[PDB]
């Protein structure tokens, strides 16, 4: 249970922007402003519940129809949120509600929390081509908006899921590119080549979720989930790429993407971040210290669907290779935009190209997460390390190290508010390679530091020195703590010394084969900044017990003792972990003996309480008395006496009573079964 | 940071603050997120007064931003700040400087329709045959945007 | 055979200031100027002196009953003193400069040895330890390893971060269990085909190289990587417009580049161990 900067809104949070030391949440019916430093709400602006009407038009508002003849009151889901700074600094926000119609909030020249005082709706009335609606930006049923300055114009690239609600004179487009007017009072589409739309016929058939968009290398990229093919059952993730231009969508191509387990495919992309790699990861995936990589957290489809099961895998595509795959000359045609038939498609700026094969890459977690639904990813470098920030449908947030070589387990793992983790995320760095992520959960945004997380979580000395290097943790007698705040001169990052506190069974038969269970601490050895039991050695006197690694851990060891020929009592168990050794002076090689049994006879029905008598009958793991090959069920066990109920034979006959203690075997008196 | 204040004053239009901040040793070439100096911002918004003041203090008239690679002259040419264009050129702006897309202030003015600026740039000695990275001259851009008056001047 | 018959201070026995103090603390003594007997030296079973700046262990000969040594993080360059420590069981000389490992020849009671970070080139001396049970030769410059063919008792074995290109010698080490071959130049894998007792394995981050080839506009270099069954491991990520037309990786190289590469990946399971063979094959060009 961690304690972090914790802002909670009264309505769900769709979207999030950090600007000039403030945080702008785009929320259901709301936009909030929090302070970057402590997440206290400074200001609100109510985009509040709004009234839909055929007669009530898109930038004019109405309680002048509130009494309603066929008009509904509607929740204003935030779909987009862009700070723009080429013009005079302004928040542009785009709601779901008035045919997807953005407004600008203009910050006064000092108060930055002032979303409130100067706000213009953006809808210029349409006169040249009254059919078009370029101020209708966002789609109520799924949008991604990416804004970038280009050629002295603010450009808006926009992915929109679209559903055949044939809106007279206000249609929406599936992807499109429009610029603002310098008059700030309307968007314009530059030519008819500036949108590509799902054909009216398939507008329902089934749709195109837009998960993510980003600009890199002079292309715009969209990430997408849609229809391996049209009316074709199974779903699918693609990239969409096109030239970064006002003038229209130019070198348009969608190419499928495949994540696999190693084919076990994760066809539904859930979230994605784009960042540079650190050296370790770099080396491994095709490298370039200064290269853009698409980290994508994927998921497996419920068969014949687009909904995700709780199976996840993340895998990373350097955009440099994405391009290669796009450029390398095999090639289909855009089935959802052109016909499957007619010209262009029976042929080969102008053409729009689907690809027939995916670019595949393997899970980088290699199943580490194949039982949970990862819903959010983010990424950062610490020195050589590349670190994922992960989020889950169960509410769990966790920091992992990314690697092929090394199947790493998360060094941070815990519960954020029971509501799932949102794919909308912010990372912001500060000098010297720290910073924080802002992380949305239902309706709460949390400011999780990238690094310290804090250092006092670790409770044992071994776990403390296993902590990720960036936290810079050491052990101060009884706490995992940084050196600047250590109050004894006992702080260390190296001294993990072994320690035993219990060992069972206490003894073994001379034949051995007994597997010991040594509980304790720090039995492992941190090699190359990674713990294993490879340096661990278990010495029982002059012979060694061979460890079983699959059943052993840092706190408990498992090992089979070998055979001895002499009795030996009070023998020493030594355990070395590379740095030191620790002892346990209490183990014995017995030698169990049966002195007598009583009674020596009983009924064929069995149920006779058979008393075996002797010494060392309570070593080591398990006692198994038997008669006639049938089990003699135990009633009570001790060093000297073993009571058990004789099994039912189907014949009146004699048997020796055989006792089995691990690899030790013992016969004793014959037991007669009378009739 | 006086430089951040200078940047904000530059776009705000507070030429009093600009003069004061510079008197206090503000960085005349301070750069913001997009790599723009106070001079870029003043030129962008049209604050002729601030533009002159900054140049007097020693602003880099040929500084290019880190986003689009535009100089204050490029910005003035695009927006139509004829008076600023004149001052920048007198200050010693490179009339044939190109941005990241290979466009000169003449390319911009021609495409925007700023005949007055086109004439000034030509008189200064702008290359009317200079192509940009789209393979177009300012003349070509004038033709594309229907700016026949500019096209005739550039022809 | 080393026996001090007269009570002698600890300072005189061990010439190295550091190692002398170590023994001092071990024996609950007050200073290095304190006298000690051979009886007190005999009862010394376990010395722990990691990161003590010890430059020499001269005087250790008088500790016959020493079976635990920890000297990682020192300046040790000689191990002649240890040459005749009869019952030496565990030994750890990491982060040093021990190289004349031949000095262990007659240590037939030695079980677990560690010599990582010692800049060791040759290791042949290890032949004289067929009784070894835990070898640790990581982080070095080892090339050949045919010696290990006879350490047929090792249930553990490091070797990570060297230049091991041929691992065939490890073939008959069926009594193995925990093998670590990361950071090497592992191209082949048919070698370990028989380690049917493995439990833990690390075939990680190989960095193989091929002999320089004359660069053309159309280039084709045969895939060299092999799996445990001898199957050509399929290249994960090729570079520079590279495609894998089995068994040859082809490239379209218009201009001249210095080299091409293709990182690979191919999780393998040997015996009971599940590791993932990964690496980056590289090809020089001219």
Curated annotation (Swiss-Prot), chain A:
Regions of this protein lying in the Extracellular compartment: 1-675
Q: Please tell me in which tissues this protein is expressed.
A: Expressed in normal hepatocytes as well as in epithelial cells lining the stomach, the small and the large intestine. Found also in basal keratinocytes of esophagus and skin. High levels are found in liver, gastrointestinal tract, thyroid and kidney. Also present in the brain. Expressed in metaphyseal bone (at protein level).
Carbohydrate attachment sites? 6, 67, 110, 163, 347, 517, 542, 570, 611
Q: How is it modified after translation?
A: Dephosphorylated by PTPN1 and PTPN2. Ubiquitinated. Ubiquitination by CBL regulates MET endocytosis, resulting in decreasing plasma membrane receptor abundance, and in endosomal degradation and/or recycling of internalized receptors.
Subcellular location, record wording: Membrane
Where does the source fall among the domains of life? Eukaryota
Q: Which residues form the IPT/TIG domain?
A: 498-590, 592-674
> Which Cys-Cys disulphide bridges does the record give?
56-62, 59-121, 94-102, 133-136, 259-315, 333-345, 455-473, 461-496, 464-480, 476-486, 545-559, 632-644
Tell me the outcome of changing residue 327 to K: Found in lung cancer also including cases carrying EGFR mutations; uncertain significance; decreased hepatocyte growth factor-activated receptor activity; decreased interaction with HGF
Q: Where is the Sema domain?
A: 1-450
| Domain remark from Swiss-Prot or TrEMBL | The kinase domain is involved in SPSB1 binding. The beta-propeller Sema domain mediates binding to HGF.
What family is reported?
A: Belongs to the protein kinase superfamily. Tyr protein kinase family.
Q: Per its database record, what is this protein's job?
A: Receptor tyrosine kinase that transduces signals from the extracellular matrix into the cytoplasm by binding to hepatocyte growth factor/HGF ligand. Regulates many physiological processes including proliferation, scattering, morphogenesis and survival. Ligand binding at the cell surface induces autophosphorylation of MET on its intracellular domain that provides docking sites for downstream signaling molecules. Following activation by ligand, interacts with the PI3-kinase subunit PIK3R1, PLCG1, SRC, GRB2, STAT3 or the adapter GAB1. (Microbial infection) Acts as a receptor for Listeria monocytogenes internalin InlB, mediating entry of the pathogen into cells.
Q: How does it assemble?
A: Heterodimer made of an alpha chain (50 kDa) and a beta chain (145 kDa) which are disulfide linked. Binds PLXNB1. Interacts when phosphorylated with downstream effectors including STAT3, PIK3R1, SRC, PCLG1, GRB2 and GAB1. Interacts with SPSB1, SPSB2 and SPSB4. Interacts with INPP5D/SHIP1. Interacts with RANBP9 and RANBP10, as well as SPSB1, SPSB2, SPSB3 and SPSB4. SPSB1 binding occurs in the presence and in the absence of HGF, however HGF treatment has a positive effect on this interaction.
What disorder does this protein's entry note?
Answer: Activation of MET after rearrangement with the TPR gene produces an oncogenic protein. Defects in MET may be associated with gastric cancer.
**Protein name as catalogued:** Hepatocyte growth factor receptor
Q: Which organism is it from?
A: Homo sapiens (Human)
Q: Write the gene name.
A: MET
Curated annotation (Swiss-Prot), chain C:
Q: Where is this region: Ig-like region?
A: 207-285
Q: Which superkingdom heads the taxonomic lineage of this protein's source? A: Bacteria
Task: Please report which protein family the annotation says this sequence is part of.
Answer: Belongs to the internalin family.
Protein localization: Secreted; Cytoplasm; Cell membrane
Can you say where the LRR repeats lie in this chain? 41-63, 64-87, 89-107, 108-129, 130-153, 155-173, 174-197
The name on file for this protein is Internalin B
Q: List each copy of the LRRNT domain by range.
A: 2-42
What range of the intact protein is shown?
36 to 320 of 630
Q: Which residues form the LRRCT domain?
A: 207-286
Cite the domain annotation text.
The N-terminus (36-79) resembles a truncated EF hand, the LRR region (80-240) has a curved form, while residues 241-321 form an Ig-like region; the whole region forms a curved tube. The LRR domain alone (31-241) binds mammalian MET and stimulates its Tyr-phosphorylation; the LRR plus Ig-like region (36-321) are required for receptor dimerization; adding the B-repeat allows the protein to scatter host cell colonies, and the GW domains, especially GW2 and GW3, potentiate MET activation.
The knockout outcome noted for this protein's gene is:
Deletion of inlB alone decreases host cell entry; the reduction varies from 99% to 37% depending on the cell line tested.
The record describes its quaternary structure and partners as: Interacts via its LRR repeats plus the Ig-like region with the extracellular portion (residues 25-741) of its receptor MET; MET can bind HGF, its endogenous ligand, and InlB simultaneously. Probably forms a dimer upon interaction with host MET, which subsequently allows dimerization of the host MET and subsequent host signaling; dimerization probably occurs via the convex surface of InlB. Prevention of dimerization does not block interaction with MET but prevents downstream action.
This molecule's function is given as:
Mediates the entry of L.monocytogenes into normally non-phagocytic mammalian host cells. Its host receptor is hepatocyte growth factor receptor (HGF receptor, a tyrosine kinase, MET) which is tyrosine-phosphorylated in response to InlB. Downstream targets MAPK1/MAPK3 (Erk1/2) and AKT are phosphorylated in response to InlB, which also causes cell colony scattering. Complement component 1 Q subcomponent-binding protein (gC1q-R, C1QBP) has been suggested to also act an InlB receptor, but this is less certain.
């Amino acid at each position: 249970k961690y304690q972090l900067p914790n802002f909670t809104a009264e309505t769900p949070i769709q979207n999030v922007i950090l600007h000039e030391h403030h945080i702008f949440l785009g929320a259901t019916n709301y936009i909030y402003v929090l302070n970057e430093e402590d997440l206290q709400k400074v200001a609100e602006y109510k985009t509040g519940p709004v009234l839909e009407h055929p007669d009530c038009f898109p930038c004019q508002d109405c309680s002048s129809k509130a009494n309603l003849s066929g008009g509904v009151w509607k929740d204003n889901i935030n779909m987009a949120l862009v700070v723009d700074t080429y013009y005079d600094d302004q928040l542009i926000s785009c709601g779901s509600v008035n045919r997807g119609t953005c407004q600008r909030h203009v910050f006064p020249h000092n108060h930055t929390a002032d979303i409130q005082s100067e706000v213009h709706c953006i809808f210029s009335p349409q006169i040249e081509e009254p059919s078009q609606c370029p101020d209708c930006v966002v789609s109520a049923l799924g949008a991604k908006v990416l804004s970038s300055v280009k050629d002295r114009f603010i450009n808006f690239f926009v992915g929109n899921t679209i559903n055949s609600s044939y809106f007279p004179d206000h249609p929406l487009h599936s992807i499109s590119v429009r610029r603002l007017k310098e008059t700030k009072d309307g968007f314009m589409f530059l030519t008819d080549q500036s949108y590509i739309d799902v054909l009216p016929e398939f507008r329902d058939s089934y749709p195109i979720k837009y998960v993510h968009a980003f600009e890199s290398n002079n292309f715009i990229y969209f990430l997408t989930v849609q229809r391996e093919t049209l009316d074709a059952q199974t779903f699918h993730t693609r990239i969409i790429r096109f030239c970064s231009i006002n003038s229209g969508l130019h070198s348009y191509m969608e190419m499928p993407l495949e994540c696999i387990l190693t084919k076990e495919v994760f066809n539904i992309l859930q979230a994605a971040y784009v960042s540079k790699p650190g050296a370790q990861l770099a080396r491994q995936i095709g490298a370039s210290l200064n290269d853009d990589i698409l980290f994508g957290v994927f998921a497996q489809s419920k068969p014949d669907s687009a909904e995700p099961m709780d199976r996840s895998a993340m895998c990373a595509f350097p955009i440099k290779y994405v391009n290669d795959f796009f450029n390398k000359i095999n090639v289909r045609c855009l089935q959802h935009f052109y016909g499957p038939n007619h010209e262009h498609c029976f042929n080969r700026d102008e053409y729009r190209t689907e690809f027939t094969t995916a670019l595949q890459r393997v899970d980088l977690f290699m199943g580490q997460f194949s039982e949970v639904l990862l819903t959010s990813i983010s990424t950062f470098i610490k020195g050589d390390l590349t670190i994922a920030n992960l989020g889950t449908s169960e509410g769990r947030f966790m920091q992992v190290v990314v690697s092929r070589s090394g199947p790493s387990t998360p060094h941070v793992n815990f519960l954020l508010d029971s509501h799932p983790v949102s794919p909308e995320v912010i990372v912001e760095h500060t000098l010297n390679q720290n910073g924080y992520t802002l992380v949305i959960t239902g309706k709460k945004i949390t400011k999780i530091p990238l690094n310290g997380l804090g250092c006092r979580h670790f409770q044992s000395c071994s776990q403390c020195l296993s902590a990720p290097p960036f936290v810079q943790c050491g052990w101060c007698h009884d706490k995992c703590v940084r050196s600047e705040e250590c109050l004894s001169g006992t702080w260390t990052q190296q001294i993990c010394l072994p320690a035993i506190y219990k060992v069972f069974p206490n003894s073994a038969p001379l034949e051995g084969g007994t597997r010991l269970t040594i509980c304790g601490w720090d039995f492992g050895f941190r090699r190359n900044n990674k713990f294993d039991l490879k340096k661990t050695r278990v010495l029982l006197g002059n012979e060694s017990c061979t460890l079983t690694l699959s059943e052993s851990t840092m706190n408990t060891l498992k090992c089979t003792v070998g055979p001895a020929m002499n009795k030996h009592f009070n023998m020493s168990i030594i355990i070395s972990n590379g740095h030191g050794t620790t002892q346990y002076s209490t183990f014995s090689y017995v030698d169990p003996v049966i002195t007598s049994i009583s009674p020596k006879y009983g009924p064929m029905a069995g149920g006779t309480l058979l008393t075996l008598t002797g010494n060392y009958l309570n070593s080591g793991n398990s006692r198994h008395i038997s008669i006639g090959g049938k089990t003699c069920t135990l009633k009570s066990v001790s060093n000297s006496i073993l009571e058990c109920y004789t099994p039912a034979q189907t014949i009146s006959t004699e048997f020796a009573v055989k006792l089995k203690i691990d690899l030790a075997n013992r016969e004793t008196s014959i037991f007669s079964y009378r009739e | 940071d006086l430089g951040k204040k200078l940047l904000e004053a530059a776009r705000a239009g507070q030429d009093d603050e600009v003069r004061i901040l510079m008197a206090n040793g503000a960085d005349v070439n301070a750069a913001d997120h997009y790599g723009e100096t106070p001079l870029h911002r003043a030129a962008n918004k049209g604050h002729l007064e601030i533009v002159e003041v900054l140049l007097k203090t020693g602003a880099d008239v040929n500084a290019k931003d880190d986003w689009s690679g535009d100089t204050p002259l490029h910005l003035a040419a695009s927006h139509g700040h004829l008076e600023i264009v004149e001052v920048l050129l007198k200050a010693g702006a490179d009339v044939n400087a190109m941005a990241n897309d290979g466009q000169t202030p003449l390319h911009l003015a021609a495409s925007r329709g700023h005949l007055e600026i086109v004439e000034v740039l030509l008189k200064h000695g702008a290359d009317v045959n200079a192509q940009d990275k789209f393979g177009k001259t300012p003349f070509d851009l004038a033709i594309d945007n229907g700016n026949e008056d500019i096209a005739e001047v550039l022809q | 055979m080393e026996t001090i018959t007269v009570p002698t201070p600890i300072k005189q026995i061990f010439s190295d200031d550091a190692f002398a103090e170590t023994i001092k603390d071990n024996l609950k003594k007050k200073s290095v100027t304190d006298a000690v007997t051979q009886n007190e030296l005999n009862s010394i079973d376990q010395i722990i002196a990691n990161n003590s700046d010890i430059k020499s262990v001269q005087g250790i000969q008088y500790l016959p009953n020493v079976t635990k040594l920890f000297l990682n993080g020192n300046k040790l360059t000689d191990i002649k003193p240890l040459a005749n420590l009869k019952n030496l069981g565990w030994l750890f000389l990491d982060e040093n400069k021990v190289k004349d490992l031949s000095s262990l020849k007659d240590l037939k009671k030695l079980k677990s040895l560690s010599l990582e970070h010692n800049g060791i080139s040759d290791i042949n001396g290890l032949v004289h330890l067929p009784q070894l049970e835990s070898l640790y030769l990581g982080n070095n410059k080892i090339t050949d390893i045919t010696v290990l063919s006879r350490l047929t008792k090792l249930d553990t074995l490091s070797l990570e971060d060297n230049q091991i290109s041929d691992i065939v010698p490890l073939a008959g080490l069926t009594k193995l269990q925990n093998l670590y071959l990361s950071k090497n130049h592992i191209s082949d894998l048919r070698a370990l085909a028989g380690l049917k007792n493995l439990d833990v394995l690390e075939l990680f981050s190989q960095e193989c190289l091929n002999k320089p080839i004359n660069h053309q506009s159309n280039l084709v270099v045969p895939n060299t990587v092999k799996n445990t069954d001898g199957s050509l491991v399929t290249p994960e990520i090729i570079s520079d417009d590279g495609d894998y037309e089995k068994p040859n990786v082809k490239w379209h190289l218009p201009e001249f580049t210095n080299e091409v590469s293709f990182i690979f990946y191919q999780p393998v399971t040997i015996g009971k161990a599940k590791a993932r063979f990964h690496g980056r094959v590289t090809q020089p060009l001219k």
